[model samples]
Target chain A: QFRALLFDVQGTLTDFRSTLIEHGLSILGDRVDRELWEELVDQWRGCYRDELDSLVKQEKWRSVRAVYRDSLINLLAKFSDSFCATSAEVELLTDGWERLRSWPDVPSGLEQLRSKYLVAALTNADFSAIVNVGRSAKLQWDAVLSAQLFGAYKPHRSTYEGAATLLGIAPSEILMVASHAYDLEAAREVGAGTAYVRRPLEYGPTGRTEDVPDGRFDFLVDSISELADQLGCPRLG
Target chain B: QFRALLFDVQGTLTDFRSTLIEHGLSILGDRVDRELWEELVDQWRGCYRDELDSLVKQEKWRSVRAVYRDSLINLLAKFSDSFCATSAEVELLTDGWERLRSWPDVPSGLEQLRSKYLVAALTNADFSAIVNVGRSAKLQWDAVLSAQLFGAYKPHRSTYEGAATLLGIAPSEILMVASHAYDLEAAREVGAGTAYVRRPLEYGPTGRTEDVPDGRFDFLVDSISELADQLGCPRLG
Candidate 1:
């Protein structure tokens, strides 16, 4: 059994649409329709993932707030004045990622697993953002480990190593659980166990990816409840 | 507004009795009455506080498990052969500290405070023990910092300094929240803001400490719910 499971926050635990789309709708007014706003978030998030990979490769470390803001600025230009955010509006919209809701199964699933194992967060989100997301979602994790702590991002070996160091455990004993193939693949390369969780609505209708899990990971599950059963947690009487 | 908060775990967020009493009762069987068992825990916990103070002064750092186990052995010997714990039995009893339950207001109050500040655990418990205690209580702290991490106990400047370093914040900026006036006073000496809570049942019926608020701390509140109101957290719609 895996001694610990390090979770990736944005998609695995949180259903980002809950924060992004609603926040996007509130600030943009009728400037952008709900359909367009969802598409925009999908693109913005896509750019963020790409930027994170590139920055990790280049050995660059900056706050994800900066990275997301950069993506927001670039994407806003693609839209006309008819449906674009003001400077203040952009600030609110960019902060949407920091406020998210958990997927239907996350809060309960993490609770059961936490009872059995050292359930924690190992995410690319900055400390405050990931903390808020888990807090708001009511997923009480054992520890919240962020790539920001190590001045690196996910897919970087140091990010995985940092988690192992903090837990006072080996990388092989810690399982990296996420919705993305590349994240698990990177973790596996660095000797951490991998579990792929499916989140088909992560990017909404226009840009859903990783709906079906990749074959390479150890356990592929559609929900954390399934993960808990696999781990064999003992419920309190 | 406070940028971060460092919480003391044992009696602040978790009401340890929920786990400790049941575990003790189940093991000691009918040998010790419920009242006697509660009194024993109070005496045992009292020894731990004095031991911690002595250890900090001597610059002697050992696991909290050792502190608890040592106290258990001495106290169990004091009681007749009518009730006792072998070394192996003592091991199980000592672990009772690792499993705990949150005060009723803790989960919701922590969630609101978390949205507004960086919430983390700063305790004398070993890292694994604090992590497990908080996890079991469903308290999702952003980070878990323990005296064991620094190889020193509280009231030592290094303990506060260690938390500041890991949080990447100045000690002056981080607020230390705990139910113990001694803990808050120690944090205050090191330039950290202090918030003293009231947890009267911390050591059970015979050991109710901090039933009243301390005048010197920055914020005096009865519950985390009251703290959230003072902090002006926006309720989710």
Candidate 2:
């Protein structure tokens, strides 16, 4: 029996791209083209992922918040021809990450899952950022474990293993749920059960292009609520 | 400005002795004298403390749950003349720690504090143990940081500093609230602000006589709700 459900916050539980774009529009107004703004949001996210990848490859540790801040500065510099924002504005835009919204299904689904399992957030987001995001989304979690606590980000073997160790449960007793297959794969490598949560619009209309082959995970579902249903959590009704 | 509040769980948020005594009576009913049972409860608690003290002094890492289990076994062995319980019964008694109830002021006070400050549980209890305690007490926390995550228990400097690092904030911005003087003092050594919460009944009947000298911490209060009031969080009315 699974003792806990580990959720990936970025694209799994939270819709980062939409929230970033909304905040960007609010801050930049019509000065930036809509298409270019979306691209900027996507690229900023890409840069942050690359930054984490580079650090993990080099076996170094850095704050996810710091990586996002730096990535935003570089992305803004690249888009300087189209938009101009002051230093304070740049900081504000970066801080907007803490305001990401949960998917529509998350609140009810997570609440149901919490009734049976210890629902925790295991995210690559900085502790403060995730805490802020949880508050913004009004998400209730038993515990919020972050990459910084493990001195490594998700997909790094240590990150998954460290969380299992901290939870005082065998990895097999944890179901790692994520929109990204790579995260679930890494968790699998650490002996954890995996659940593929398909966030079709995580990257906007085009969505994620990566293929999720059949039978790759222990469970696959479209929403957190579906996962709850699949796990036999009775509906509130 | 304080951005977050770090709470110590055992005595500060929970009254462990009473719960343990109650559970002990429920499980071993009438087999043991009430006075001897009280002594057993106190000594069992003392044993856990000594185990942690020994670990910290030796600069070693061990699961708090394991320590508790072993301590309980030795405690039960010492009291074998009065009570006879099997291995499973001993496990049940040790697991009683997770069911500890919160103080009367906790739920409302914590709700008030959460309205303004990011409230996280920073405890010496094992991660699962703390999570169970929080769930059993129905406490809401933004994050739960355990000694198991840092590989060292409290009063060891790294435990305080590690929590600060994970929260992505300077220690000074996190207020460490606890009933124990040593925990707050150690937090102060790491530059975190301190609040002394007086859990006078934490030890029950002849309550804790630990002299909390005036003006040692930034805030001193009789209960969590008072601390919330001290921090200027208006009443829910």
Candidate 3:
């Protein structure tokens, strides 16, 4: 139905939390217990998503970095001095923002999908971060769409709408493929088609106990390869 | 003495005319007269500079697309129906704005300079155009500073000074490097250091430029590589 497929990078095509937790633990260490740290991280993510939802509701827009910085500062106030990141540390954390590792299926699934659909990235990350991630993971993207351009974080209708506009396509024609239920739900609400690819190991190998019962997505698949299969591209082996 | 070098892209690191001329002739050969086409192109460039200068003085701080579109319309009005670009042709021309070729010495010269100095591009081009140019030319800039960010064009003291501010450097600690004498002169008036590299072939093989004589700049060189040599690195072989 379309010429392109837009995929979310983190937690979908790539292992986002592993990189975050590994780097976060290294930086925070014993100052914050791993369980407490993960809770705080989850809270921070929740706050960011909440903020984005509120902004979208209000039709207000701001950069993802700004949102991250605001959330980080608020989250830090709840912790001790040892958990507080300096400006340099914050910069280092931002550098880690780009270094997520792609899932095993990404390279092959994307390679197969590329023969039929123009593949691109539509993410909340900064432009340079997305570029660096693409380079490091060897992910092929015709164009990397960043919320940095729109000065807003995703889950905002504008985030998906902006990408659709840029690609000269109607939102209905653009499929947003993401692992995160919140992200896909937002995309679906904004008139974009949606696909859910299960990323059970997203949090960590040991952490995923509750299975997410998908209800709203147009399609759900175990992997990107399976998603490509459902998209009627069986040649994507 | 400068901590950073802010460079102009067109006519400095790249030959805008030669690149456009080749592309234009290839696409619109018999529809456009060779000599007249060159004159129109030159006038288009002149309009760009004039519009930017006016905006700088007026503090209108318009986007690059606004200025370029305004100039393009004015420039195209003089051409015949066959030569005048359709909407698709206009799109092609705007798209071609990102495809300018770098001067042969730019890559090595920039690499040499970057070894010791923070280097960036501060130009009227939009962010996408600047990014595409850097990719096409293989130029590695620490940052792509643009009027797009400031919503203004160069020759404005703010455009030059704002770049230094963004780079976290003082005006005196930023060198504005250009082949255009007027651009260097403007930068010098703003208390920023200046380096003039002679792009003798910028206007094609026949044009003579006399605005900048020998010893007019903080440093003067015949090529970007020579400028690199003068700036204390000679590894540009």
Candidate 4:
């Protein structure tokens, strides 16, 4: 039986695309095509992924927010002609991540989940970043477990092991919920239950999405509510 | 200008004495004098403290609940003649900690504090233990920070430093609220703002209490609500 549920923050619960796009437009202004902002956000995200991949491969460590900040600097330099922004502007863009809004079903689904299970934000996001997101988005997590505590990001054994150690439960007793297959796969590797929640718009309305390989996850659902349904949590009033 | 409030869990917010006593009586039954059960609880607490101290000094690490369980074995052995208990009963007694209740002021005070600051349970208690305590007591902590992450107990520099690193805040910006002077002192030594909240009944109505040396802490008060008042949180309805 599952004693707790751990969630992946960025794309699973938090609406990363809308949040970054909204902030990017207000800060960067109408100097370029409105379409360019989305491209910039997308590239910035990809850059962040590459950055984290390099760090993890090299066994180096940095908070997710710090990595985002650095990624933005590179992103801006690459688009130097399209926009002009300072480190302060990059920092402000990074701050947008801390204010990411939750998907529509999140609040109610979380309430339903908490009725029967302890819910926590288990993220590669900086510990501070997730706390701010929880406060800003009003997600009531019983606890926050971040990669910063273990000095490694997801897909690493230590991150999953550290989570198990901190929750004081065996990995099999925790259901790792996420939008990303790679994250869920890693959790499964550690003997944790995996729920892959699909987010077709994680990138954007027209953005491409990955196909969840058949029979690879414990549960495949479209939203947190569906996962709650699968887990037999009482429906919200 | 504090951004967050970190609270000491056991005696500071949770009424450990009343909870332990209530459970002790229910589990142990009417075989022994009620007053004797209270004494055993006190000795068990002291034993837990000494066990943690030994671990900290020896640079060895164990979760607080494990220590509590081990300490109970020694305590029951010492009081063997008066109490006839099995390991299963001791396990049930240790479960008492998970169900500890919050003080009357805590629920309202925490709601008020959250109106102005990010509040969290920062305890030497096992990470899972505090999560259970929060759920059982209905305390809404934005996050739970525990000593288990660093493999060292309180009063160790690593514990406080790890908190700062995880919270992504400077030591000066965190206000450590606790009933014990030693915990507050340790936080203060690390440049974290300290508030000593007095819990005279932490032991019992007639229990001896320590005199907090004057001017040692940033704020000293009768309870969590009073600390909220000093920090200028809005009054509840």
- Report the number of the highest-TM-score candidate: 4
Q: What is the TM-score of chain B in candidate 2?
A: 0.97
Listed per candidate, the RMSD to the true structure in angstroms reads: 5.7, 2.2, 6.2, 1.9
Model 3 Cα lDDT, one tens digit per residue, B1-237 = 867788999779987887777767776768888787788777777787787778778887765665667777777886765477777776666555677889998988888886667677877887656666765666666556667666667777778877665555778888889987778888998898889888778877876665676677898887777877787875844
Residue A170 of model 2, lDDT score: 89
Better of 3 and 4 by DockQ: 4
- TM-score of each candidate structure, all chains considered together: 0.71, 0.93, 0.66, 0.95
Better candidate number, 1 or 2, judged by TM-score: 2
User: Which model scores highest in lDDT?
Assistant: 2
Against the true structure, candidate 3 reaches a TM-score of 0.66
The ten-residue window of minimal lDDT in model 1 chain A covers A205-214
Please write out the lDDT profile of model 1 over residues A40-144, one tens digit for every residue.
Answer: 777887898788878888998888887888889888988765466679887888778877888898877887886657888888887767766765677777787
Report the C-alpha lDDT of model 1 over B1-237, residue by residue, as the tens digit.
Answer: 467889888888888875778889987788778878887877887899899989988998987877888898898888756686667778888889988888887888887887678888888987778776765687777777778767898888998987886666799988888888888888999889988777766666565575554567888887787777777776533
Q: Of the candidates shown, which would achieve the greatest DockQ relative to the real structure?
A: 4
DockQ of 4: 0.79
Q: So what's the TM-score on candidate 2?
A: 0.93
Local distance difference test scores for all models: 0.80, 0.87, 0.74, 0.86
Q: All models, DockQ values? A: 0.32, 0.71, 0.08, 0.79
Pick by lDDT: 1 or 2, better one: 2
Question: Which has the better DockQ: candidate 2, or candidate 4?
Answer: 4
Candidate 3 chain B superposition, TM-score: 0.89
